[PDB]
Amino acid sequence: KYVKVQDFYDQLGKYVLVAPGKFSGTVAATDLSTGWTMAWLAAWNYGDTCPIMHHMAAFPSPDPYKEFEFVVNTQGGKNLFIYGVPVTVEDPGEGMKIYRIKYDGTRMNLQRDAAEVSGLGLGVHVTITPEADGYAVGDGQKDICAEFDRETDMVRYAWAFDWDPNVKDLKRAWLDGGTMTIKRLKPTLPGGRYDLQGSKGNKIDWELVPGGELAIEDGKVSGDRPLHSVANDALVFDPRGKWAVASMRLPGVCVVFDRENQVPVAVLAGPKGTPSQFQLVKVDDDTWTVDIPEVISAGHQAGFSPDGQSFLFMNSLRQNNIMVWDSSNHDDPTTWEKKAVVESPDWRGAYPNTFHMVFTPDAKKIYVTMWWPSPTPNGIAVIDAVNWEVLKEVDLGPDMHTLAITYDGKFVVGTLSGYQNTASAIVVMETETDEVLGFLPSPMGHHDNVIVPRTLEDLRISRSTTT
Amino acid sequence: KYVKVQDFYDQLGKYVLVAPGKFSGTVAATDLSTGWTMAWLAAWNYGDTCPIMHHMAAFPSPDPYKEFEFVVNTQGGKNLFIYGVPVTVEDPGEGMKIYRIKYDGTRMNLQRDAAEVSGLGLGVHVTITPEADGYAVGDGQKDICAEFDRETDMVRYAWAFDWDPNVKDLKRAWLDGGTMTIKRLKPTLPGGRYDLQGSKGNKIDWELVPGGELAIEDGKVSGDRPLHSVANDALVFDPRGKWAVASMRLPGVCVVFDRENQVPVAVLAGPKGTPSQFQLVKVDDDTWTVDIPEVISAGHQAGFSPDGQSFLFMNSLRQNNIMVWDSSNHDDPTTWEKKAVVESPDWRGAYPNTFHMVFTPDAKKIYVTMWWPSPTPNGIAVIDAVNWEVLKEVDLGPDMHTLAITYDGKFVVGTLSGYQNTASAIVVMETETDEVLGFLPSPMGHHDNVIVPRTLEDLRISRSTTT
Amino acid sequence: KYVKVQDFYDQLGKYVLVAPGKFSGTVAATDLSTGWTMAWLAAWNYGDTCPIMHHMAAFPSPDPYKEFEFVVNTQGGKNLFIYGVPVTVEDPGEGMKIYRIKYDGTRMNLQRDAAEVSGLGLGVHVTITPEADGYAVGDGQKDICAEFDRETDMVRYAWAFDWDPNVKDLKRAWLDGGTMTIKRLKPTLPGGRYDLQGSKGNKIDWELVPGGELAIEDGKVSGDRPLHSVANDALVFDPRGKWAVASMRLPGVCVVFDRENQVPVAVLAGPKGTPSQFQLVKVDDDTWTVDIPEVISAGHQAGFSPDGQSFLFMNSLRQNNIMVWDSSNHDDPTTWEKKAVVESPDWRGAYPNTFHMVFTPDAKKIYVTMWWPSPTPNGIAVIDAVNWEVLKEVDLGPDMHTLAITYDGKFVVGTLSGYQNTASAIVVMETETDEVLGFLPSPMGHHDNVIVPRTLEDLRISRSTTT
Amino acid sequence: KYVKVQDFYDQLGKYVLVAPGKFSGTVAATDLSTGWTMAWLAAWNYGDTCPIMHHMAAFPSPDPYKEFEFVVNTQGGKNLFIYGVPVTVEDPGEGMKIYRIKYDGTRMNLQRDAAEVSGLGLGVHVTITPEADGYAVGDGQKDICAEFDRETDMVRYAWAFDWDPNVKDLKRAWLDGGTMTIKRLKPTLPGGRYDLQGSKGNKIDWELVPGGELAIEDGKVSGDRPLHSVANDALVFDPRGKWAVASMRLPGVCVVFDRENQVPVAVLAGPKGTPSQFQLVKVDDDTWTVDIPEVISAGHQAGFSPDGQSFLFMNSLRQNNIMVWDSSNHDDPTTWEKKAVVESPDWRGAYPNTFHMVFTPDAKKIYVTMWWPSPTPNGIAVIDAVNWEVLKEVDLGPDMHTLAITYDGKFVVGTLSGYQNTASAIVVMETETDEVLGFLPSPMGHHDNVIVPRTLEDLRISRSTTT
Numbered sequence A, B, C, D: 001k002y003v004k005v006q007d008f009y010d011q012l013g014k015y016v017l018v019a020p021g022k023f024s025g026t027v028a029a030t031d032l033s034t035g036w037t038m039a040w041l042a043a044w045n046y047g048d049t050c051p052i053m054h055h056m057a058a059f060p061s062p063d064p065y066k067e068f069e070f071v072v073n074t075q076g077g078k079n080l081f082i083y084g085v086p087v088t089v090e091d092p093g094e095g096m097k098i099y100r101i102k103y104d105g106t107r108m109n110l111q112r113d114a115a116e117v118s119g120l121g122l123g124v125h126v127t128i129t130p131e132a133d134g135y136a137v138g139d140g141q142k143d144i145c146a147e148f149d150r151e152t153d154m155v156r157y158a159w160a161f162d163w164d165p166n167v168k169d170l171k172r173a174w175l176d177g178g179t180m181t182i183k184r185l186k187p188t189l190p191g192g193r194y195d196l197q198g199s200k201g202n203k204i205d206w207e208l209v210p211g212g213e214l215a216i217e218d219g220k221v222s223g224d225r226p227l228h229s230v231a232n233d234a235l236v237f238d239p240r241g242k243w244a245v246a247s248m249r250l251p252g253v254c255v256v257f258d259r260e261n262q263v264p265v266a267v268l269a270g271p272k273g274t275p276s277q278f279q280l281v282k283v284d285d286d287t288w289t290v291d292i293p294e295v296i297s298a299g300h301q302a303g304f305s306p307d308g309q310s311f312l313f314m315n316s317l318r319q320n321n322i323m324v325w326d327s328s329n330h331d332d333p334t335t336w337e338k339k340a341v342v343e344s345p346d347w348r349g350a351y352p353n354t355f356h357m358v359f360t361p362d363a364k365k366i367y368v369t370m371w372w373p374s375p376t377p378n379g380i381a382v383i384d385a386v387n388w389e390v391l392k393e394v395d396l397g398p399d400m401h402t403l404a405i406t407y408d409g410k411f412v413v414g415t416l417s418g419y420q421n422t423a424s425a426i427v428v429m430e431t432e433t434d435e436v437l438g439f440l441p442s443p444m445g446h447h448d449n450v451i452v453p454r455t456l457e458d459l460r461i462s463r464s465t466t467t
């Protein structure tokens, strides 16, 4: 006569979901096999005065129920003012903290702020190296990305990016092309530390929102240096090692970096109608430039399929499509060539935008998100990654954010975030016939989620290769 | 082929669950028919620098999905340092805020802080008047309870309680008995406002924890005047009207108040072995005293059955039982007499402690919480409220708190809260055969939860008659 | 045959004197033309539990006998314990109230508490803007000063000041210099309100007394953060408009602010032997710093001459003198240069200290107080403000406080306040030949007094330009 | 060139004025030879929660500049709610404190509360015994007067008065006559202490205002037992010793008491048209009664000329006159007979009410106050005390209260108190030709004032023989 919710969880397996809460100021881990929150942490408990808990990634652990470690960052300043919430803290904390957190089988333990350890605070995507010996963070207000060592929380290398527009007018500054500089960033404080915590470094006062390339062009984003902005988003990793790729929203390119030798090696060009690559020019041992004649479209999501054979960059807003490179030559990224573009009427108009993806373990399908401003239903589109075509899309609810997948490939687990003020949930869809199985309560504004990986191999379809 | 969680929710009915999050700093409403969080609010977004979101109660709304209004209060000061969270907050806010919040069918809207409007801040239980025309709040650091007008947030009446121990030292102050003073508290500021916001009026520096009667006796609770403490917990309402009952943890009594005439009328004596009532003595128009020759045990939970015929007070710690009075004579509480005592061989230890209850609509069963300190499993006991016997005890997990019931009587919904740092969940139990149907994630440390009532009759089994 | 006291008052003209009473808890307006107190008000009647009525200023009124409005603030907490009075209050109010009071021709009426309207409570000097459209208040326990809107009692701008001493030992924290931060202070609560009423924000538990910079160095002033104190005193106005100046006692500087654009523009260096100015450094749009290599002396009284040509700051205790800048360039305070120091062989001891002044309407003379601890007679010094020389000193009695002048320039009216427990009076001195005409009874501990101005020109020699 | 106010003071002589401040909460002593306030005290500094400083009297001292002691009492409860002031303290302290204060030549020292010592709290007139070995206080809410020992502050004797109306109806309770009881009051606590502090014993909730005999008749005075009220006012002393006289406002009588034998001896009948005396009946050793056929008018002011030859009682409201008895027979007050009535065509209305008086040292003249509700000017009448006629009436200003005289008989010094919310001052009048010399500021609501006596003979025209 009665339904037990346990039957629903029994089918999911012994997987641990973890998600930060953005405006909620919290991070939580959930047992998908029982429905319990295993543990949660509220950053205000630690004196954090603007705990916008933003992106995160978890290191593999052979048994997450015993222990696991993750990294979660924060945003601050005027990022507090860009949602519908009529917040009242007019001068909030500067955020850009990089927290190290460990779950010990019972509770979450805040271990330290790595931005205080290294001196470098970064506020957008967090990713784990495929060796699980470190992590990377990017930031689109300072335009810096860095890989950090896991043991020491010290920077291994950090790169700063700068835009020199052909036309020094905000409306034309990207559309009419410009030169992007890539500059090795060196510490200036004793013990090899950076002087770049909080707001130090910020070119603009908040991270650009969806369709923010328009806001910046119209002079609606305050800051010292918006003409010089490229809006770095992420540093993602080739799961075969060696390469890391930094994605630049505004000039619509990704930069391939040699992790070991600490040099850029290639610049991939995002928009449909451009060549596979632009020309990287060395200026000196610390400085490279790339000329971009015009920016046909901004881009956002960047990442690798889990065999590392395909590299993807999503064009957004001006174009909406998935640009796909053959990246099978692991020895030379300057040979990576455009091999497909995924297009669909599903990419209706300016919206939806696709900012998140996850692959199946065998690389044959991709789940990608479809985001719209309130009130249009947001949801998930399924991509056949062999023919590079959209299979299907499903409507879910408001404000779709990140996707993770269970490591046996059976269930995609996503978050919907209420634009920080309305309905929010965890969503579960089964990959066998791509049907939504339903929603679980989630009183948080997640801009990220992961399933804690068990092995290095698990990282290939976790927060390492994609965002 | 797969199980859809939507079948679980389909059986529950169109009920909205609301709960604050204690250390999470948040409050959230969830749609039990779909599993979505409907909306959540983080008080740090509104300049709250100690947002320990504490107790709450919801006003009836003819359609909660369209809108509903609720009340939620906060604790602050040293309440921050008494859980297993290693807090590093320098100057915590003082709490005792009394927020008015409105869900408008999309989001929660902070309306105002009634502690600022009225001047009176209180940080323990919140209850709705059975007329839905106001609310009451109690506090066990200041020992004050008051009923507030719903429309103006001004106080209707407030009462201050004070202990005068027979023996002047903490170990014996309650054991060897004393006299409690009941004092009409009137305002002192322009506009008829109190001067009692934040920590003003505190006798002790945190609310007593479970078994905290022993901590205070042993000189382990700091504050200005712990010898004067009575630890008021709540002001609960007779569903038939007229009467309100203030519970006093330390001297193990409840005081019955006439609401419209604004006078105390009876003192109910908690512990097994004491008479039905103690002698209330009028000292003047604003002051009453009651002599308590010895305090056999402290008490906590207090409430009426939904038809007003029974009144309950839980003895806790030194005795663990449910004391029951016949309150069927609505016209005169000085006639209310003890009629039954629920006891169990399981409750001889210090724990479990039973601090929360909910009746079924027909009043024949009560569900009560069984709390233990870590690591003993916490649960729910089912009480036969016709024969006053325990039917059944179910184990669930750590740190059990409040219970609500859907208004057709079919499902109990509870919260488990991880002691603010471990596993946390919403539990659902069906009342036909008293079986646990499972758990939903809830990354919050709730010490309260309600189902939003639609009618005044629904309040009889919500946060009005019991806590 | 008999002397009529009316013949004495006939000569003073139709001027209204207003003074708060400090420990008396009262404030009073006196008619200098008849000897009557026109009206008085006792703040304990309005539920004030620490009514230390502190500083005040009065808005101009076309006819003060018909009506006038004024602002008066309060101090609390341990300010109650630092005078000679053996107070026995156990739970004193926190003070920092900012009362708006209106005399209506018959009585005083308490309009409201601006600290409750704005959320910002401040307990030291109160000043009227030169346009009479607002008022300012400083505070040296919180180190915050602010200009408020007269119609709404909301803050126009507020500045917080913090000391970062070179040496982290109280004895040398100021002598060995440090860096002061000047931070824009923004609200945190709904309605644009601050959360800084009462003791919220205090770095130290009472305002430093005369020479109390030795006590703080000596570890004798309790508080959460005495190493960060600068003891802000006042915010005084350029009678020509545009600029406001904040005095800081401990590091011996004044900061010039642009009121319109809301930025600091200059730092004036107090001690003889320092440059005219120290270098103001902008850190971001809300934050400036200034490096002070050493603090040679603390300073106190600060004010402009009524034509705005001269700015003055008194060095107190370690040097006793009047530092004078040329402020004739209204367009650029960074050009203001020291042009004179008033010294006297009589001022080479630790005392007298000169904490108050008033100019004649033509700016040619100043009357300045000479304060000493008991038992040395306190008095008034007359300063030649063209040659910058002491003209005359006259002894009066104990504990000299403020000086006001009748707006025709003819009579200086001051207050002596018995150290809150001995002799107190109003003194009347004629300015033609600078003789004391006598004393009038005043049972009050006034630390302030004003003559109600009639015009905006009158404010140039009232509580607007000097304290 | 200028008039010095010092010439005004030089003519008054070396006299010390002292006055309490009623709503100001303060008391203050003023040097009439210099214009300085010598010292003031604020009762709120000592924790007094309703410092309505009411009546006072000073002991003689050989040199008041070097030191003097005085007694000053307070009122509490609903006496706070009876003036213009919109007070906000809804539940004030109960008052009825009797403070001992010493001026030590520098400051006021609060020595103790005699009401705590003795356990008897009384709130109306305070007088000094003519031997200066004690003082007396009366109270018109409890209807008790007592003489206290100066060294111990213990009661020598206390008397309770009770009214038993011929008709139990408030309107006719006095008019239609009744029996007053005079009852010896004995201590009821260990150590010879009373249990009558604060509001203990009150029959009505405030002291009757001028004409308040109409308010109590009309049911407008709240309290336990207004039908039992006599409104006792004062206990004044025959300057020849032996006799004390207790005045009763509502029944229009004075009771003469033998101080040494502690027994009433006579009842003087106030109203014009009644015999000299009514018949005192002994009931037992502790109890006497007197039948009052009907009460034609209420009375108030009562006192002796400084030689003890005349005793006066003022009828007020229903008749306004001065009733005079020949009290030359020091050995037997049952022989004292009416000898004159001072009447005026100007006293036909309900007002003015003549509540206070002082004689010149040779007993030839009397200065009596003429009080009216706002807005009629209040003033002073001069009485020829040889022919029992009015010599002169002068108008002064609002709210005239008490009069004292310099002991050389040259200057009458009085207080006006602005109904606690408007204009207040000290007035000085020369007695040779009865001219007002003018006003000094006094930001106080004085209902009493004295000049400190130097000898036992000075007391005869101080707050000992009259009020």
Ligand SMILES: [Cu+2]
Binding pocket: A125, A233, A234, A300, A301, A355, A467
């Ligand atoms: Cu991104």
Ligand SMILES: [Cu+2]
Binding pocket: A054, A447
């Ligand atoms: Cu985000």
Ligand SMILES: [Cu+2]
Binding pocket: B125, B233, B234, B300, B301, B355, B467
């Ligand atoms: Cu409780």
Ligand SMILES: [Cu+2]
Binding pocket: B054, B447
């Ligand atoms: Cu709690």
Ligand SMILES: [Cu+2]
Binding pocket: B355, B356, B400, B401, B402, B446, B447, B448
């Ligand atoms: Cu609970």
Ligand SMILES: [Cu+2]
Binding pocket: C125, C233, C234, C300, C301, C355, C467
């Ligand atoms: Cu000052």
Ligand SMILES: [Cu+2]
Binding pocket: C355, C356, C400, C401, C402, C446, C447, C448
């Ligand atoms: Cu002063």
Ligand SMILES: [Cu+2]
Binding pocket: C054, C447
């Ligand atoms: Cu002061």
Ligand SMILES: [Cu+2]
Binding pocket: D125, D233, D234, D300, D301, D355, D467
């Ligand atoms: Cu009287």
Ligand SMILES: [Cu+2]
Binding pocket: D355, D356, D400, D401, D402, D446, D447, D448
């Ligand atoms: Cu009087």
Ligand SMILES: [Cu+2]
Binding pocket: D054, D447
């Ligand atoms: Cu009086």
